[model samples]
Target: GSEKADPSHFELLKVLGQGSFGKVFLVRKVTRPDSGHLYAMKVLKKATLKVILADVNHPFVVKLHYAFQTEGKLYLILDFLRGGDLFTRLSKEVMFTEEDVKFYLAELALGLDHLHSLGIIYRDLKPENILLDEEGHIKLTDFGLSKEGTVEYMAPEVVNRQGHSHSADWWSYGVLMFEMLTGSLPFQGKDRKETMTLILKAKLGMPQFLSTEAQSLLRALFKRNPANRLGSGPDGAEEIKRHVFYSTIDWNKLYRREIKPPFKP
Candidate 1:
């Protein structure tokens, strides 16, 4: 496939990052049929992405500004994020304070809430997939492994290969929260195969540094049985909101982004 740049309307800047399937570049829009704006362009082979975006759409997920195929290649125009990914920040710091985790977790909860409301299940939820905007707000990206539901996060019942519901996202949120607090994944295997084995077996171990409240929430979220798991049903998020660790939080103020986060930048 021959990839061509839109010379008449946009100028491609430097490469932002690269992945297994494509490359993302920083670009400036020179001409706009509506409003002139800058964006990140993710270019990939059309044959590679035909089925991925077939019927997907969500706000928290990266917005696809434009997608078109030319000469067997596919180009996706997206919102440009200048601050990079959460993984970079996590690696730079030895650990995150409870407040830091709380702030990000709250934001992530809202994001997941939006995704779940739309019946989208993001199976891959990890620090690496979260991007920071210029304002420090978190943005989720990379839906390659995302699907309606496939057991990547939720318990056995929810992981049923057929598909899963919104509760599955909460399970993933719990895993991420625990990992962020402890600086490691709860379940570890030397490789992907071993990891999957452990996940299927529902085996998890927590570190000693975690707070009791944090541990309680984690245990509830990662329960082996999805039916009995916290936040697996109508009251999932509400249940999480009531957890002891978050008892001191003011939900409304937190959602409004008014409260000072638990950690300093």
Candidate 2:
């Protein structure tokens, strides 16, 4: 259960940036501000995030320590992660090493696996929505509930305006993998139309730098047929976990957040 913390109980240090139509604030304890513990305070409508946070409790998912409401906003006091988000880090990158990509992907797979286990679909899986901890590990944050998926990350069924299931997240995961390794979205175009066109029907190409295992995994994941997609099985993420690209992964260890990440943030 989360605390119904008063916003005045915290010393809002700085704006951490905004997401989900809410303002994010970096705040410290009012009683012991110099003791150094801090938190992220998210402002939103009452019914949404509180319920979402209450249902999810995992290491990779953002931790909300407290929640409260003002006449105008619902404030969720969350764990303050200082290393910034994946999108900002990616903006400075030429490209990520296979290991760099693998570490984050493995972490996310575990997170998505747990989330799917609860029957929730993370519609947003872009780099911008993921945060890094001081240890350079993926400290997943700020994703919302979804009935459908995102455009650039859309599954084939979703692209065709059909109903989709958790398979949509696996499709987004595949898109994220390509973007991290290549520094570009695999099926991008001048605008949304072209982007959708490319994602819908263009020849999907793999970068030469990726290992054969990685290439094969992406190929299987990007299949336009959701019925045959890598993660569309009844086992969901378990099927993708069995892929050769993750042959060295210890899914158990990854779930325990025990893997040493490749980057230093």
Candidate 3:
């Protein structure tokens, strides 16, 4: 929960980015007097930082190098990621190639595995929150609205807030996979109200472009009833891995990152 940092230890660089809740800057670590190492720094209001830290932790999640309170503001030192976020890449390419999608999905699956294992559900799994490191590895960020709910990506039980657990994360994983493949959401409405209605109905539509196996996997995943959704069981991830849609994936090779992903950076 709490991270450690000292003000003088880091030399501020240019501001790298900003969000609704905070700002991110590039910084260099200064050893004792002048030795330098680079890092990223995220600054947010103290109140907001507390709420954010209370919600998440996973290797896929952004690493918090340190967090400190000073003069009414909160500072969070983090790992510097030079490649930016998935949103930027998507904006440049419009849509990902099949190979790219599969590569990203594999990494995302591993990330989700880590979160679910910790009993933490990442409610928001859209492209916007997925950041890429210099090596093209994906890192999940943004935990502001991550608690639980049965919306499009959320499981039915979570939507009703009856009782939520790690399985809820898998539901979001399905939505995310669908979005990555189709370049659009599986469920959509003219407006927010209509979107809510569609989500409530949970009627899944297959895009003509999707492979048959992909369609089947999506169908099983997007089930309205939490009890019947794919990857909601004790062996959810394994079950997903075994699906025919993922038949091309070499289980051991994938885990070892030895398989050449479908797409090149």
Candidate 4:
């Protein structure tokens, strides 16, 4: 696949998204005359790292099908998820049941585990980065970047520049769970600076409606001390998988994508 991918090879269908770095477009491969398959083409203004995407192989993470470059930009062809992002779903649904949240967390924990095993800290984990296939199975996207995470989900250690590891991702995971269950951010503020301050010092407020198991997991994950975080130990994400909140989940079946997802798009 060393052959350079040219813009001429794809027919742009529509723009899927845009960011500070570049834009993503829905495209159809025109060169494959036999099959006009759809793909998400990410075009970056500057040189991008393709090696990390190439190395990652996981059911719950986006797959990179092709990587090519031109003098002014770089491009990556990826799976075009029709179900869109988790954020969009969350906005429409407002909140999810505990059972549904459990399924999502279980899947995402396994996804992050795969990255941690490779010594790759996601550094960015949020609803927007969680894409859903047509069947609603989650796949994490956006990788090989350190500064891409939304400020609201950043860990205290990261905010303080105290250094971080895989534990930071769990903190973000905690925030996401809180948002999903409560329909609001746990440590948000009026502005970015205040949000950072709150993340660093705010007392976590768990709604009384949450299950005890959910509250316990949130407390463990929100540990400001990275060393004390739920998934920070040698067991890695296994620590999270074993939590009582996921007692009913069969990790093996979940990894096989055999378990029926709680929601389907």
Alpha-carbon TM-score of each model against the true structure? 0.79, 0.91, 0.81, 0.94
Model 2 pairs in collision: none
Candidate with more favorable, higher lDDT: 1 or 2: 2
lDDT-superior candidate, 3 or 4 = 4
Which candidate leads in lDDT? 4
TM-score of candidate 3 to 2 decimals:
0.81
Runs in model 2 deviating more than 4 A are 1-4, 31-36, 45-55, 146-150
- The Cα local distance difference test for each model comes to 0.67, 0.79, 0.69, 0.86
Q: What's each prediction's clash count?
A: 2, 0, 2, 0
The model with the greater TM-score, 1 or 2, is 2
Is candidate 2 or 3 superior in TM-score? Answer: 2
**Residue-wise lDDT of candidate 4 within 108-181, one digit each (tens)?**
99998888777777876889889988887899888654333588999998999988778889999999999999
TM-score of 4: 0.94
Residue pairs with colliding backbones in model 1 are 99-262, 231-236
Candidate no. 1 TM-score: 0.79
CA lDDT of 207 in candidate 2? 77
